[PDB]
Amino acid sequence: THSHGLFKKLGIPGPTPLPFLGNILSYHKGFCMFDMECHKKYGKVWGFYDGQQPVLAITDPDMIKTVLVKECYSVFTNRRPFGPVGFMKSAISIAEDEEWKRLRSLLSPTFTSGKLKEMVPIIAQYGDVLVRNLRREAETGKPVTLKDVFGAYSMDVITSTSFGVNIDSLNNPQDPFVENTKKLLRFDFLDPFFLSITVFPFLIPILEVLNICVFPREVTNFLRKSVKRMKESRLEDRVDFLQLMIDSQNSHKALSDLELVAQSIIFIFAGYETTSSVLSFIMYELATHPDVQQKLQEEIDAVLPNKAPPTYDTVLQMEYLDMVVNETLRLFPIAMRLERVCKKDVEINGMFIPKGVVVMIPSYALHRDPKYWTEPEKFLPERFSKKNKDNIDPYIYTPFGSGPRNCIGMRFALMNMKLALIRVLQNFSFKPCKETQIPLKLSLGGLLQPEKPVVLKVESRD
Amino acid sequence: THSHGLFKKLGIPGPTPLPFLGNILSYHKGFCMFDMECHKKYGKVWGFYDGQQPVLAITDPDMIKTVLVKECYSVFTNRRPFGPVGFMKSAISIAEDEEWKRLRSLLSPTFTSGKLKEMVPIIAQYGDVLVRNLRREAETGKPVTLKDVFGAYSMDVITSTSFGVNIDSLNNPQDPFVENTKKLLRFDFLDPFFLSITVFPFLIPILEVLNICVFPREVTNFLRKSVKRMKESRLEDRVDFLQLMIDSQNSHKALSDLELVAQSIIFIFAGYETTSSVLSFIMYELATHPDVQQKLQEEIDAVLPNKAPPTYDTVLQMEYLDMVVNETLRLFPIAMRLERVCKKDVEINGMFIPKGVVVMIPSYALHRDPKYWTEPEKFLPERFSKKNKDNIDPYIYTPFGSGPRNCIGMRFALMNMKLALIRVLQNFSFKPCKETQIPLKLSLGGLLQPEKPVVLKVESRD
Ligand code: HEM
Ligand code: HEM
Ligand SMILES: CC(C)N[C@@H](CSC[C@H](Cc1c[nH]c2ccccc12)NC(=O)OC(C)(C)C)C(=O)NCc1cccnc1
Ligand SMILES: CC(C)N[C@@H](CSC[C@H](Cc1c[nH]c2ccccc12)NC(=O)OC(C)(C)C)C(=O)NCc1cccnc1
């Protein structure tokens, strides 16, 4: 129908599409399973149909580089639309071409190593909070649910690093400011709503004229005014994302107020469930590989004797920790794919690409390719040792993507997660319960997350 | 366009419609203002257009009777659809024709005077709760917001009379069971979403296939399982609406489980903001007419000396109280209109009515008609004295509608509100603050509710 002959014409293999649905029935096992099977069955490039929308998959690292880096500005600048977005049209990760470029320009200085070293003390205080809450659970030998305790942690670091609000969310789960922000959850792109948006993408315009949005209209409204209060209470009466944006609107064309709110929202959205999720995947591996946990506890005490508090520089000093984080990300790259919309008829690395195709890099499946990783399913942190870390193709292992449009939040995310692990492990060990799901099964959904949530035994090194 | 010549053809007056919008621009001042102006300008019958949808207004009490009573089953059985409803299609107030008739049959015995006398003791306990919360506000001379304290009250009576759950919502505003139920708020039929649904009623089918609903998909999901837990904890291990429905599914065709949940939801929806709102409108009048308040306090002590607790029968004994409630409802009939969809070409009281028209009775405007009420804007409870209560046309004063499809919840609503007022006034007097809005302005919105929320001074008769 109307475009389902495209790949068959270019000589590109793939699963044969059904009318209207294309291949979306093949998502019944999740993006991850579909992508590995496809890589296996079909080889180095393949093609499928998200309804009428042609998606070209690629796995050659040279080709990936062209797309993510070389022709990023010229050809492959934007992501694919996904549903009605309202004013969130202005958020950097949604925006396009020159508005994107301007936004990415206007926001980059907020994510430098400099500002991040200034934020480290704030992100630290809530590690202590995390500990006392964990100790409360450990002095009462009851299995712990990480996503809850790490959620409460991530939530705290966001509320602080982005607005100055200081909440113990785990113990104030019903503060107005914690309630809204806990509704900014990762979109399930295989839930009813989003699948239909894929079979009926013409519906998106209809919703937009009805001010219906995939960002709940009330959470956005709460923050828009919460910001405009903060804005006008500091102006006038250092050191969060909001103040860094306030200072910036003092490319070009400055930052509009509505533009400012939207970024603020996308930072919470980005930083809340990801931090929570990754931190849980890591504690899962640490707990099912007690040697890796011991070796990391040993490393942490070396740098920080006497449970010394971690600093920006003592954090970047810890190599095994960096290894442990990077390998967890290999097995659970929560973005799962990267995607670029081809804006022009192009030819790259010997392959014609017609305008309008979505180019997709199947991150999860490349992270578990046996042709670039030995024993890809095993959790083996040494793959990232300063010895082996050189035989790893930065276009095969892309947990934050690559190029002008990679994750702007990368250094903060990594720092935020590491500060958590250092303080937690300084004080506790983590052990399987019987109710622990070993082996952790991944969700057949549209999200990278455990089937059953991770529950563990926490014990005090006291 | 496609139907805007209808009234002009039948000789029926009304405001001239614009293409596509019909007359909806005339709602800029609210349904209430539009309806009085229309009654004034145009007389005993008029016509307008909710987009393409012809609505015929009527004010002759004989004609109203035919519509609400005589030809209710034959002709005027259903209300007008309003947006996507999901499984709430099964709720009695939404359902149609034989399913309605069956539901109204299967649910009527739950609202008898018998069951209501059995519920009175439950509804009483939360009057005491209401008092201690009020006393806490009165011992701290801070103006009170009625909708909050009455909301918390109404919320408590619902949670109890419908599931057995016993919560002090005002002090547990963050119990999971109170959180969801506080989201079941009255629909604003002049908010963006519903106006568009009126200009684009073809959009309703589109939303329905997207499982988008005007009952938030999460509140419904919470209760559906909350019920199925309650259902299977009482079955097996008297005296609420849920148990009365459980007993009924033990016309005809019994009550399906999904059918049962939906009614449960519609009862909360119905009984929460209405009780809250009416109770606030009443305290407003009592507080701005201190004689009426005194006369009612005097009456209550006569029946119930020593702050005696109210009983079902001592409640029906209080005539001035019944007067005060009924007159408040005159000035603030929160339904505002009644509506019936004409299902066949008919002729009633000398007027042809073509199939598909919505027949509408402008309750608010009839309640303030100078041709049936002297000084209609004044709050004068004596209009309802056992002397004058006979010169009041039950088809002009219809705060609960009339006929086979009037409010099934009427006796409960009235009893629930009166039990509140008796206990409250036994203990407190209510006085204007400076921040009180005198005179209360009504919302220009699609709801009957105060412009500014009612704030009063509460003082202890101790
Ligand atoms: C463990 C944590 C995180 C992971 C694994 C992650 C991963 C990713 C990935 C794969 C992308 C797409 C990059 C590409 O297209 O090549 C991305 C984009 C993005 N991330 Fe993250 N992310 C994380 C946390 C964060 C945080 C904390 C922020 C805070 C501001 C953030 C903000 C963004 C933004 C704004 C984009 C889009 C940038 C643009 O399109 O210009 N992310 N992230
Ligand atoms: C002060 C409180 C209330 C007022 C003023 C009120 C008013 C009304 C009005 C005007 C109608 C439409 C009747 C008609 O079309 O003629 C109605 C319908 C209805 N009410 Fe209420 N109501 C109140 C409280 C309640 C309560 C507590 C319940 C509890 C179950 C309830 C359940 C219903 C139902 C189910 C219908 C639709 C009945 C049907 O269509 O078969 N209402 N109400
Ligand atoms: C999908 C939500 C997160 N809307 C995005 C728009 S594009 C940023 C990217 C989304 C994405 C990556 N491959 C995809 C393949 C198909 C469809 C969408 C995507 N993000 C992403 O990794 O999200 C998680 C970890 C998958 C939840 C947005 O604006 N996200 C802010 C954000 C979120 C998370 C991390 N960093 C930034
Ligand atoms: C509109 C909401 C309440 N959906 C109803 C469907 S029809 C019951 C009726 C609605 C109604 C009366 N004139 C109208 C004129 C135009 C459009 C709709 C209506 N109710 C009604 O009085 O609602 C309040 C007090 C106006 C909020 C529903 O199912 N409502 C359950 C319910 C609510 C309140 C009282 N009793 C029952």
Short mmCIF file of N, CA and C in Angstrom, two decimals, chain B residues 136-242:
data_model
loop_
_atom_site.label_atom_id
_atom_site.label_comp_id
_atom_site.label_asym_id
_atom_site.label_seq_id
_atom_site.Cartn_x
_atom_site.Cartn_y
_atom_site.Cartn_z
N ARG B 136 -11.23 22.21 64.58
CA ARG B 136 -9.80 22.48 64.48
C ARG B 136 -9.54 23.77 63.72
N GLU B 137 -10.37 24.07 62.73
CA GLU B 137 -10.23 25.33 62.00
C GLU B 137 -10.83 26.50 62.75
N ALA B 138 -11.80 26.25 63.62
CA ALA B 138 -12.46 27.33 64.33
C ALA B 138 -11.71 27.73 65.60
N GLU B 139 -11.05 26.78 66.26
CA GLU B 139 -10.19 27.13 67.39
C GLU B 139 -8.97 27.92 66.94
N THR B 140 -8.67 27.94 65.64
CA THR B 140 -7.59 28.72 65.01
C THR B 140 -8.23 29.69 64.01
N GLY B 141 -8.70 30.83 64.52
CA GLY B 141 -9.46 31.83 63.78
C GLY B 141 -8.93 32.20 62.42
N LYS B 142 -8.95 31.22 61.54
CA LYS B 142 -8.52 31.35 60.18
C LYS B 142 -9.70 31.08 59.28
N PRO B 143 -10.01 31.97 58.33
CA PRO B 143 -11.15 31.74 57.43
C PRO B 143 -11.08 30.36 56.80
N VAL B 144 -12.25 29.77 56.57
CA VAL B 144 -12.37 28.40 56.10
C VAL B 144 -12.84 28.41 54.66
N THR B 145 -12.35 27.46 53.87
CA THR B 145 -12.83 27.23 52.51
C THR B 145 -13.78 26.03 52.51
N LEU B 146 -15.07 26.28 52.27
CA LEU B 146 -16.07 25.23 52.44
C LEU B 146 -15.84 24.04 51.51
N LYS B 147 -15.56 24.31 50.23
CA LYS B 147 -15.44 23.21 49.28
C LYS B 147 -14.37 22.22 49.72
N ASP B 148 -13.35 22.69 50.44
CA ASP B 148 -12.35 21.78 50.98
C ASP B 148 -12.90 20.95 52.13
N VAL B 149 -13.53 21.61 53.10
CA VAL B 149 -13.99 20.87 54.26
C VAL B 149 -15.23 20.05 53.90
N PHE B 150 -16.08 20.59 53.02
CA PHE B 150 -17.24 19.83 52.56
C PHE B 150 -16.83 18.76 51.55
N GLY B 151 -15.88 19.08 50.66
CA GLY B 151 -15.31 18.04 49.82
C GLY B 151 -14.84 16.87 50.64
N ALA B 152 -13.99 17.13 51.64
CA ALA B 152 -13.51 16.06 52.50
C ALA B 152 -14.66 15.30 53.13
N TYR B 153 -15.72 16.01 53.48
CA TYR B 153 -16.90 15.35 54.02
C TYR B 153 -17.57 14.47 52.97
N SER B 154 -17.94 15.06 51.82
CA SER B 154 -18.61 14.29 50.77
C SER B 154 -17.80 13.06 50.41
N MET B 155 -16.51 13.27 50.14
CA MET B 155 -15.55 12.19 49.89
C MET B 155 -15.67 11.07 50.92
N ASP B 156 -15.66 11.42 52.21
CA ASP B 156 -15.83 10.41 53.25
C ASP B 156 -17.16 9.67 53.13
N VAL B 157 -18.27 10.38 52.88
CA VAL B 157 -19.56 9.67 52.84
C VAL B 157 -19.63 8.74 51.64
N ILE B 158 -19.01 9.12 50.54
CA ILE B 158 -18.99 8.23 49.38
C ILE B 158 -18.15 7.00 49.68
N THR B 159 -16.87 7.20 50.03
CA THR B 159 -15.98 6.07 50.30
C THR B 159 -16.63 5.06 51.23
N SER B 160 -17.49 5.52 52.14
CA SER B 160 -18.13 4.63 53.10
C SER B 160 -19.44 4.05 52.56
N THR B 161 -20.38 4.89 52.13
CA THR B 161 -21.65 4.37 51.65
C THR B 161 -21.53 3.54 50.37
N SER B 162 -20.39 3.52 49.70
CA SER B 162 -20.29 2.76 48.46
C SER B 162 -19.28 1.62 48.48
N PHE B 163 -18.28 1.62 49.37
CA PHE B 163 -17.35 0.49 49.45
C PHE B 163 -17.02 0.02 50.86
N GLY B 164 -17.47 0.70 51.91
CA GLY B 164 -17.03 0.34 53.25
C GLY B 164 -15.71 0.96 53.67
N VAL B 165 -14.94 1.51 52.73
CA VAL B 165 -13.67 2.14 53.07
C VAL B 165 -13.94 3.36 53.95
N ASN B 166 -13.19 3.47 55.04
CA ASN B 166 -13.39 4.49 56.05
C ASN B 166 -12.12 5.32 56.12
N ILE B 167 -12.17 6.51 55.55
CA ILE B 167 -11.01 7.38 55.51
C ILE B 167 -11.42 8.75 56.03
N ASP B 168 -10.51 9.39 56.75
CA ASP B 168 -10.58 10.82 57.02
C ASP B 168 -9.78 11.50 55.91
N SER B 169 -10.46 11.76 54.79
CA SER B 169 -9.77 12.26 53.60
C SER B 169 -9.07 13.59 53.87
N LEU B 170 -9.71 14.47 54.64
CA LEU B 170 -9.10 15.76 54.93
C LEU B 170 -7.73 15.59 55.57
N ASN B 171 -7.58 14.56 56.41
CA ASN B 171 -6.30 14.29 57.07
C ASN B 171 -5.52 13.16 56.42
N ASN B 172 -6.09 12.51 55.41
CA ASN B 172 -5.37 11.50 54.66
C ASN B 172 -5.49 11.83 53.18
N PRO B 173 -5.15 13.07 52.78
CA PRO B 173 -5.50 13.52 51.43
C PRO B 173 -4.71 12.76 50.38
N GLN B 174 -3.83 11.89 50.86
CA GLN B 174 -2.85 11.20 50.04
C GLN B 174 -2.91 9.68 50.23
N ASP B 175 -3.98 9.17 50.84
CA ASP B 175 -4.32 7.75 50.73
C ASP B 175 -4.61 7.43 49.26
N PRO B 176 -4.10 6.30 48.74
CA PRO B 176 -4.38 5.95 47.33
C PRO B 176 -5.86 5.99 47.00
N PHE B 177 -6.70 5.53 47.92
CA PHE B 177 -8.12 5.49 47.63
C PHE B 177 -8.74 6.88 47.60
N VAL B 178 -8.15 7.84 48.30
CA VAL B 178 -8.69 9.19 48.23
C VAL B 178 -8.14 9.93 47.02
N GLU B 179 -6.92 9.61 46.61
CA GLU B 179 -6.29 10.32 45.50
C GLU B 179 -7.06 10.14 44.20
N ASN B 180 -7.30 8.89 43.82
CA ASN B 180 -8.03 8.64 42.58
C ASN B 180 -9.40 9.31 42.62
N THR B 181 -10.17 9.02 43.66
CA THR B 181 -11.54 9.49 43.74
C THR B 181 -11.64 11.02 43.69
N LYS B 182 -10.59 11.73 44.09
CA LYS B 182 -10.58 13.19 44.01
C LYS B 182 -10.36 13.71 42.60
N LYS B 183 -10.11 12.82 41.64
CA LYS B 183 -9.97 13.19 40.24
C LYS B 183 -11.27 13.04 39.46
N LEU B 184 -12.31 12.49 40.08
CA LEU B 184 -13.62 12.33 39.45
C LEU B 184 -14.43 13.62 39.63
N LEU B 185 -14.09 14.61 38.81
CA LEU B 185 -14.65 15.94 38.89
C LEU B 185 -15.60 16.22 37.73
N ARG B 186 -16.49 17.18 37.96
CA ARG B 186 -17.53 17.53 37.01
C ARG B 186 -16.91 18.03 35.71
N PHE B 187 -17.42 17.53 34.59
CA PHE B 187 -16.95 17.89 33.26
C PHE B 187 -17.29 19.34 32.95
N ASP B 188 -16.31 20.11 32.44
CA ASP B 188 -16.53 21.50 32.00
C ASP B 188 -16.89 21.46 30.52
N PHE B 189 -18.18 21.50 30.21
CA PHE B 189 -18.63 21.37 28.83
C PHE B 189 -18.36 22.61 27.97
N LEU B 190 -17.69 23.64 28.51
CA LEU B 190 -17.19 24.75 27.71
C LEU B 190 -15.67 24.87 27.78
N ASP B 191 -14.98 23.83 28.27
CA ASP B 191 -13.53 23.76 28.23
C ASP B 191 -13.10 23.41 26.81
N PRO B 192 -11.82 23.60 26.45
CA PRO B 192 -11.44 23.40 25.04
C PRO B 192 -11.93 22.08 24.49
N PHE B 193 -11.60 20.99 25.19
CA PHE B 193 -11.90 19.64 24.74
C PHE B 193 -13.37 19.47 24.37
N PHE B 194 -14.28 19.94 25.22
CA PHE B 194 -15.67 19.62 24.94
C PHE B 194 -16.27 20.50 23.85
N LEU B 195 -15.83 21.76 23.74
CA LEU B 195 -16.27 22.60 22.63
C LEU B 195 -15.89 21.98 21.29
N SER B 196 -14.63 21.56 21.16
CA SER B 196 -14.20 20.91 19.93
C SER B 196 -15.03 19.66 19.65
N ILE B 197 -15.28 18.86 20.69
CA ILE B 197 -16.16 17.71 20.54
C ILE B 197 -17.52 18.13 20.01
N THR B 198 -17.89 19.40 20.21
CA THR B 198 -19.15 19.92 19.66
C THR B 198 -19.00 20.44 18.23
N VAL B 199 -17.87 21.02 17.89
CA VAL B 199 -17.62 21.37 16.50
C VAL B 199 -17.13 20.16 15.69
N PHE B 200 -16.48 19.20 16.33
CA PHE B 200 -16.03 18.02 15.61
C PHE B 200 -16.61 16.72 16.17
N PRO B 201 -17.92 16.62 16.37
CA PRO B 201 -18.49 15.37 16.93
C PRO B 201 -18.12 14.11 16.18
N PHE B 202 -17.76 14.23 14.91
CA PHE B 202 -17.15 13.12 14.21
C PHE B 202 -15.83 12.68 14.85
N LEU B 203 -15.27 13.46 15.75
CA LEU B 203 -13.99 13.08 16.34
C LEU B 203 -14.14 12.03 17.40
N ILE B 204 -15.27 12.05 18.09
CA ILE B 204 -15.64 11.05 19.08
C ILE B 204 -15.36 9.61 18.63
N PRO B 205 -15.81 9.17 17.45
CA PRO B 205 -15.46 7.81 17.01
C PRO B 205 -13.97 7.58 16.93
N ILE B 206 -13.21 8.62 16.62
CA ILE B 206 -11.79 8.45 16.43
C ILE B 206 -11.11 8.16 17.76
N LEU B 207 -11.36 9.03 18.74
CA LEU B 207 -10.94 8.81 20.12
C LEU B 207 -11.35 7.43 20.64
N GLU B 208 -12.59 7.01 20.39
CA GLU B 208 -13.04 5.74 20.94
C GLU B 208 -12.17 4.60 20.44
N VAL B 209 -11.75 4.64 19.18
CA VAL B 209 -10.92 3.56 18.68
C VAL B 209 -9.51 3.66 19.24
N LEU B 210 -9.15 4.81 19.81
CA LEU B 210 -7.88 5.00 20.52
C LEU B 210 -7.99 4.79 22.04
N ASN B 211 -9.11 4.24 22.53
CA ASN B 211 -9.29 3.96 23.95
C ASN B 211 -9.04 5.20 24.81
N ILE B 212 -8.97 6.37 24.17
CA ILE B 212 -9.02 7.65 24.88
C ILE B 212 -10.42 7.86 25.43
N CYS B 213 -10.50 8.33 26.67
CA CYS B 213 -11.76 8.43 27.39
C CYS B 213 -11.83 9.72 28.18
N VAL B 214 -13.05 10.25 28.37
CA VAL B 214 -13.24 11.43 29.22
C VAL B 214 -13.30 11.08 30.69
N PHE B 215 -13.30 9.79 31.01
CA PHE B 215 -13.02 9.32 32.35
C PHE B 215 -11.58 8.85 32.36
N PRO B 216 -10.66 9.59 33.02
CA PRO B 216 -9.22 9.28 32.95
C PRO B 216 -8.91 7.80 33.09
N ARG B 217 -8.19 7.25 32.11
CA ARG B 217 -8.05 5.80 32.01
C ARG B 217 -7.44 5.18 33.27
N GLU B 218 -6.79 5.97 34.12
CA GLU B 218 -6.12 5.42 35.29
C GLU B 218 -7.02 5.34 36.53
N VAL B 219 -7.83 6.38 36.76
CA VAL B 219 -8.80 6.34 37.86
C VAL B 219 -9.73 5.15 37.69
N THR B 220 -10.27 4.97 36.48
CA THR B 220 -11.13 3.81 36.20
C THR B 220 -10.41 2.49 36.45
N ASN B 221 -9.15 2.40 36.03
CA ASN B 221 -8.40 1.16 36.24
C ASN B 221 -8.17 0.90 37.73
N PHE B 222 -7.88 1.95 38.50
CA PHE B 222 -7.64 1.77 39.94
C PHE B 222 -8.86 1.16 40.61
N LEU B 223 -10.04 1.70 40.31
CA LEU B 223 -11.24 1.26 41.00
C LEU B 223 -11.69 -0.11 40.52
N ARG B 224 -11.54 -0.39 39.21
CA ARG B 224 -11.96 -1.68 38.67
C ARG B 224 -11.34 -2.82 39.45
N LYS B 225 -10.05 -2.69 39.78
CA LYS B 225 -9.38 -3.71 40.57
C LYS B 225 -9.62 -3.53 42.07
N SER B 226 -9.74 -2.28 42.55
CA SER B 226 -10.11 -2.06 43.95
C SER B 226 -11.43 -2.74 44.27
N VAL B 227 -12.37 -2.69 43.33
CA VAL B 227 -13.65 -3.37 43.50
C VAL B 227 -13.45 -4.88 43.49
N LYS B 228 -12.76 -5.39 42.47
CA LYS B 228 -12.56 -6.83 42.35
C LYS B 228 -11.80 -7.41 43.54
N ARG B 229 -11.05 -6.58 44.27
CA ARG B 229 -10.50 -7.01 45.55
C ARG B 229 -11.58 -7.05 46.62
N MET B 230 -12.28 -5.93 46.80
CA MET B 230 -13.40 -5.90 47.73
C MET B 230 -14.39 -7.02 47.45
N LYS B 231 -14.83 -7.13 46.19
CA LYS B 231 -15.76 -8.19 45.80
C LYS B 231 -15.32 -9.53 46.35
N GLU B 232 -14.06 -9.88 46.12
CA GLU B 232 -13.55 -11.19 46.49
C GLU B 232 -13.00 -11.25 47.91
N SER B 233 -13.08 -10.17 48.68
CA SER B 233 -12.78 -10.24 50.10
C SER B 233 -14.03 -10.35 50.95
N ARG B 234 -15.15 -9.77 50.50
CA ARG B 234 -16.43 -10.02 51.15
C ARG B 234 -17.02 -11.36 50.72
N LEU B 235 -16.76 -11.75 49.47
CA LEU B 235 -17.16 -13.05 48.91
C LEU B 235 -15.90 -13.91 48.92
N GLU B 236 -15.73 -14.69 49.98
CA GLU B 236 -16.69 -14.70 51.08
C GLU B 236 -16.02 -14.50 52.43
N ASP B 237 -16.64 -13.65 53.27
CA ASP B 237 -16.21 -13.43 54.66
C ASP B 237 -17.30 -12.72 55.47
N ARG B 238 -24.75 -5.55 53.35
CA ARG B 238 -24.16 -5.21 54.64
C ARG B 238 -22.99 -4.24 54.50
N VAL B 239 -23.22 -2.93 54.25
CA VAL B 239 -24.53 -2.28 53.99
C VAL B 239 -24.44 -1.23 52.84
N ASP B 240 -23.37 -1.28 52.03
CA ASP B 240 -23.02 -0.21 51.08
C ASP B 240 -23.60 -0.46 49.69
N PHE B 241 -23.41 0.51 48.79
CA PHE B 241 -23.91 0.38 47.42
C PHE B 241 -23.30 -0.84 46.72
N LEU B 242 -22.01 -1.09 46.96
CA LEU B 242 -21.34 -2.23 46.33
C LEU B 242 -22.01 -3.54 46.74
#
